[PDB]
Amino acid sequence: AYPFDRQKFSIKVDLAVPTNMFIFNEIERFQQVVGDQLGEEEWVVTSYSQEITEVPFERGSTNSRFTTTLLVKRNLEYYILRIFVPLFLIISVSWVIFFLKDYGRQLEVASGNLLVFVAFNFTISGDLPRLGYLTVLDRFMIVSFCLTAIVVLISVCQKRLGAVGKQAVAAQIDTWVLVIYPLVYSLYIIWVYLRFF
Amino acid sequence: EPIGEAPLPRLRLTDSGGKPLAFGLIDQPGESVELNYTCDQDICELVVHVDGTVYRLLVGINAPNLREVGSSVFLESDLVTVGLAVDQIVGVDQRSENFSVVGTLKLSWHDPKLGFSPDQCGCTVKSFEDASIRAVAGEINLPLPSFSFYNQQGNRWSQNQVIFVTPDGRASYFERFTVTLQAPDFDFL
């Protein structure tokens, strides 16, 4: 669900001697479990818990264990400002230039957007492990990658198609890409609303 | 005798080990308490308990007609003097909110124990360093202060430790360190 996820952190304390020699009995809080100031503004703690269990070892020996868990959430002020604002602006303008009937310029802007996105692809991957599956931010960028390499196909088809003289197809098909582009992204967002909220 | 409008607290004189020796019996006036004891042993180490689980308390020695800050003190000492100085600021790390300093520390106090005549060594000041300091007091079994940098992250590289002892009892402890601390009041607004 990155970057809309709430992971949990554990601290496990374990005994190095068997059960018959020692065990843990009770949990006593001589101090506040979570101090008021901790630093790390990116993560915020909402709860905590403490418990004691018994884990097995060797063949016939068990030892005590004592677990502390913290539940955290991610702030979204950084991500909304470095990624979501620059990406919304570049997509919007690449759709508003479509009003101008200067063809080929439609290709030129769409070609440049192909170059920009592969930069935004390496940036986001900079601070994540070499994951084995798909996040949310990775799906959004795959959609925009595939969609923008389709408008260049239309622009290269429109350019040649207008040389013969059949501008009626060119003008009529021009308005078609004027509605598909802003409709699709809204469709994709709806598919994300249900799976997380 | 309370300063004013303060309830009378409990008092009790015991032994330093913990056994009790005497107790205080109040009078009708209620504005003061009385406790009396006279030793008959070879060593008399006394402790005054004041229980309330501001107020004024008077303590005397051989003071008949004590009614109506003497020549000398009459209580022991465990008061520690401190001092710190900053020599360098190695770095500042904005993104992780910490910084490092190189400084020096001075702890000094008074103890009637650990004294020594100038005949045992022929000298006037004794010196210990490094980890031999842990190899002194345990045999004598006398309590030493132990500090701690509260907001330190990681390790503290201290390159010198030394304590100088003067026969009457004064001990001065110096230390030179390099530590990384946490700054939680960073406000970037």
- Look at the block and give the residue holding tokens 């701690």: B148
Which distant-in-sequence residues (6+ apart) come within 8 Å of A71 by Cβ?
A6, A8, A45, A46, A47, A48
Q: What distance in Å separates the CA atoms of residue A53 and residue B70, rounded to the nearest whole number?
A: 63
Amino acid letter, residue A66 = F
Residues in chain B whose Cβ is within 8 Å of chain A: 96-97, 182, 184
Report d(CA B115, CA B9) in Å as an integer. Answer: 38
How far apart, in whole angstroms, are the C-alpha atoms of residue B13 and residue B49? 6
**Token pair belonging to A93:** 């303008």
Residues 6+ apart with CB under 8 A from B131: none
Residues B15, B68: contact at Cβ < 8 Å?
no
Resolution at which this structure was determined, Å? 3.5
B79 DSSP 8-state letter? P
For residues A128 and A111, give the distance between their C-alpha atoms in angstroms, rounded to a whole number.
Answer: 28
User: Distance between CA atoms of B107 and B173, rounded to whole angstroms?
Assistant: 5
Asked whether residue B20 is marked as a ligand-binding residue, the answer is: no
Residue B110 has phi, psi (to 5 degrees) of: -120, 135
Residues of B in contact with A38 (CB under 8 A): 184
The verdict on whether residue B184 carries a ligand-binding annotation is yes
Q: Could B97 and A37 be called an inter-chain contact, meaning their C-beta atoms sit closer than 8 Å?
A: no
Q: How far is B97 from chain A (nearest CA, A)?
A: 7
Distance CA A83, CA B5 (A): 67
Alpha helix stretches (DSSP H) within chain A: 79-82, 84-96, 105-124, 137-164, 167-196
What's the CA gap between A155 and A106, in Å, rounded? 6
With CA atoms as reference, report the closest residue to A151 among A110, A112, A180.
Answer: A110
The phi and psi torsions of A186 (rounded to 5 degrees) equal -65, -40
Q: List residues bridging with B47 in a β-sheet.
A: B14
List, in sequence order, every residue forming a beta bridge with B85; answer none if it has no partner: B104
Q: Known binder of ligand: residue B188? A: no
CB atoms under 10 Å from CB of B116, counted, come to 15
Q: CA nearest A36 in B: which residue?
A: B184
Give B184's contacts in chain A (Cβ within 8 Å).
37-39
Binding region of A = 38, 40-41
Nearest to A51 by CA among A72, A68, A63, A71: A68
Contact B23, B13 (CB under 8 A): yes
- Contacting A residues, span 101-160, partner chain B, CB-CB under 8 Å: none
The DSSP result for A91-130, as a single string, is: HHHHHHGGGS--TTHHHHHHHHHHHHHHHHHHHHGGGS--
After which residue numbers is chain B interrupted with C–N beyond 2.5 angstroms? 53, 68
Cβ neighbours, 10 Å, residue B100: 16
DSSP per-residue codes, B88-152: EEEEEETTTTEEEEEEEEEEEE--SSS---TTTTS-S-EEEEGGGGGGTHHHHT--------TTB
CB contacts under 8 A, A 9-48 vs B, are 37-39
Residue A12 Cα, gap to closest chain B Cα (Å) = 20
- The coordinates were experimentally obtained by cryo-EM
List the single best residue of A34, A37, A43, A77 to mutate versus B (max B Cβ within 10 A).
Answer: A37
The alpha carbon of A149 is separated from its chain's Cα centroid by a whole number of angstroms, namely: 22
Between CA B158 and CA B105 the distance in angstroms is 11
Sheet holding A43-57, edge to edge: A8-14, A61-74, A43-57
Backbone torsion region of residue A183, taken as left when φ is above 0, otherwise alpha when ψ lies between -120 and 50, otherwise beta: alpha
Please, which residues bridge with residue B93 across strands?
B98
Chain B contacts of A37, Cβ < 8 Å?
184
Q: Match 């303590």 to its residue by tokens.
A: B59
